[PDB]
Amino acid sequence: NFMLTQPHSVSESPGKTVTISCTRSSGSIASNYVQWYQQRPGSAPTTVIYEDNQRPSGVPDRFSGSIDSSSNSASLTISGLKTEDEADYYCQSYDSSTVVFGGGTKLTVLGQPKANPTVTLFPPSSEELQANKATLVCLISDFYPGAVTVAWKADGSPVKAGVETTKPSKQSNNKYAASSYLSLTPEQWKSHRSYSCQVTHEGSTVEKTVAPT
Amino acid sequence: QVQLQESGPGLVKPSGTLSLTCAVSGGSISSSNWWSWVRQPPGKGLEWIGEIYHSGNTNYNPSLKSRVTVSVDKSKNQFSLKLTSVTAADTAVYYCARDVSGGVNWFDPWGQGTLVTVSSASTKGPSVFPLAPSGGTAALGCLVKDYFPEPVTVSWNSGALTSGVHTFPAVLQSSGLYSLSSVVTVPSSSLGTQTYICNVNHKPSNTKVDKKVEPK
Amino acid sequence: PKIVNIGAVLSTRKHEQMFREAVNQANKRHGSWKIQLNATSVTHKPNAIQMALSVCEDLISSQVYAILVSHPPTPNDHFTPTPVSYTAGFYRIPVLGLTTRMSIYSDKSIHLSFLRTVPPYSHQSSVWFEMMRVYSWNHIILLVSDDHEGRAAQKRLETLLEERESKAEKVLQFDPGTKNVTALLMEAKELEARVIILSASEDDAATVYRAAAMLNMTGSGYVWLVGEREISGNALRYAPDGILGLQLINGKNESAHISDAVGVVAQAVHELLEKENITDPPRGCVGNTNIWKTGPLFKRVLMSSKYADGVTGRVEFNEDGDRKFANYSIMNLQNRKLVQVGIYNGTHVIPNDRKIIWPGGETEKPRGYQV
């Protein structure tokens, strides 16, 4: 079989025109019908382009395709790029032996708006402190782009051990999810007056704070 | 108006069987298409597996020609994929899909997609803990401590609340268990009079739980 | 010691040493106490003009006793040995072919100097006969390109049918070059039979396939029966599924065919030089314009030379040209994927346990015959 090769990541500004190379190793490209998929993150795949360049009903004219005979590469092109063109992408050919897919393309839309993070800090629920644990919930939701430093403070002092924070990750709305988990033991919850959650976000500072009861 | 739904996303042992299955909706099987399977290890691309006609004729991928079987059922309008001898690399999401056929291979519509976690550790339901509410709106949730494997699935008021919900991805602890939470921002004056029930659905270990949250 | 050269032309450099090894081993084979072979060779040219000189200058040059001919396995290089077989035909130096398949080369007395280990497209027409032996295809239509290949593919089918109470319901023929076939396929469709046979070029084959898909002939009771080439490259990439395009076993396996030719040439050159009255070949290609009286006699020994335990099976040739009678492998299409349904051994079709789809995604074997 033949390995299709895509650009690892691509990028292009909104309202523009971006190109997606699907380079086939062995055997001519135009030989076998090429298709194109937009796999939305946390969703299962959906055709954008069937039969090299044949388009379903509902998928717009901005989705078009062409097959470079001479370079041995199918090309998915989108013009007039929108915020909802930010997604993963996959060409799919076949041969006499198999059903091959590409390595894939990450298409991030160059130039977007920043959003300052909407935090939500939650105390240990009673039934948890009963269980003999103390676990503090910081949910950070709706920030562009995906980077967030989280700091956890008792009274005001740096709390180190038993701090848990994700690799932040993409939502539907492009803007990203993230959460954080402090593993105390019951008594530590009580001993101090207050507990903070700093969420610096590319310069800007955010920090909610909880008391014993 | 054709749809396709697949079996529970579970655990499977090293050197083990994959056991997946796929009902067909809004349509038939004896229809002239090929019913087939694909797979995605997490944080990576796609990869084909094989196909089965309505007759039962079959076509496997050369890299796995020795480990795969696809079978059918012309009464339920369902079929199934088995994939034996599994390992670490075989940890992936699995989609059944209709291969529109009169020439090409072209997949439409796809399956939902179910993660066969390939591991030796035990399947155990997560503990549920209600996160009570504290401008003109206010938050509340359900702490889902310690579980394996992914997935967990949640709803608020059994579907009723779409407007308001956010579900966060879980974190990997050192103890190997995960932990997530989900919220629902709610109008500040519905606190008290209106209910909010989290439908903690965890499919691999037979764990369906419910949990009422209320003002602390 | 004595030296007897064997000229060769091949794909890569990687075959030169894969010819050179074969002259080694089949000297470790042949007694060597009387005569001892050596390995003369040069790579191939795409531009057919150069090739001929590269035979004259590089090969015919060195008193060469035979010229092993093979190339890049593309359908544009099946007229590279043309220059090679005129250039070796002028002198009556035996030209072994290793891979080329167009039938002009076998053809009844046209290349008087041209051997080959690989039976041509036109012998597919005896496997088609055996496809129609089994399955019971009583009513065929045959369309063929109007060229050397197609006529020698159709006639050779007709002569096997002639002793049967049958022929084609209608034989059909188009242009080898036409990008428009819509016309002819019309009357083709408007007929009693329902199992249609083709000997066409990958490109001329393509046209008619998607031209016959445009014009609704792909599925139902219809059955498309073709050979190799009609499923190689651009044919197939516009074919239907349900087709039974044949494929020659080790038909593109160069280093397996070279292996045979030096062994057979060793089991011929020792079958030659044992003879009283044996002559040296003529020296250079310039200003030499006469054969060597053991030209035909080496070739007439070459044609009548057996060789059990070859690689591509057993190497034996026939009367008309000189071509092997090697196994084929009967392919079937199911979801844009060629996957074996049976195996025509030398003589007949013996099918495996694999089950065989038909046109329009047909589980049931149709019949020809209207429906």
Numbering used by the authors:
A (entry chain C): 21 to 233
B (entry chain B): 20 to 153, 159 to 240
C (entry chain A): 24 to 394
The authors write:
The NMDAR is a glutamate receptor that forms a cation-selective channel found on excitatory synapses, playing a critical role in multiple neural functions including neuroplasticity, learning, memory, and motor function. Anti-NMDA receptor (NMDAR) encephalitis is a devastating disease with severe psychiatric and neurological symptoms believed to be caused by pathogenic autoantibodies that bind to the N-terminal domain (NTD) of the NMDAR GluN1 subunit (GluN1-NTD) crosslinking adjacent NMDARs and driving their internalization. In anti-NMDAR encephalitis patients, pathogenic autoantibodies are exclusively of the bivalent IgG class, and their binding can induce cross-linking of adjacent NMDARs, leading to receptor internalization and an overall hypo-NMDAR status. Among them, autoantibody #003-102 (#003-102 Ab) showed the strongest pathogenicity and was used as the primary patient-derived pathogenic autoantibody throughout the present study.
We determined the crystal structure of the pathogenic #003-102 Ab Fab’ in complex with the GluN1-NTD protein at 3.5Å resolution. The GluN1-NTD consists of two subdomains, R1 and R223. #003-102 Ab bound to the conformational epitope on the surface of the R2 subdomain. #003-102 Ab interacted with two loops and a short helix of GluN1-NTD via both heavy and light chains. In the tetrameric structure of the NMDAR, the binding surface is located at the side of the receptor, and thus the pathogenic autoantibody is likely to bind adjacent NMDARs with its two arms to crosslink them. The GluN1-NTD is separated from the domain involved in glutamate/glycine ligand binding and activation of the receptor, referred to as the ligand binding domain (LBD). We determined the epitopes in more definitive ways by X-ray crystallography and HDX-MS and discovered that #003-102 Ab binds to the conformational epitope in the GluN1-NTD (R2 subdomain). This epitope includes amino acid sequences surrounding N368/G369 but does not directly involve these amino acid residues. Findings from this study, together with the previous mutagenesis studies, suggest that the N368/G369 region may be critical for maintaining the native conformation of the GluN1-NTD. Remarkably, the centered amino acid stretch Q357-V362 with L356 (LQNRKLV) is a 100% match with a portion of a Toxoplasma protein in addition to proteins in bacteria that are associated with CNS disorders, but does not completely match with any other proteins beside the NMDAR GluN1 subunit in mammals. HDX-MS demonstrated that both #003-102 Ab and ART5803 bind to nearly identical epitopes on the GluN1-NTD of the NMDAR, primarily in the R2 subdomain, with partial epitope coverage in the R1 domain.
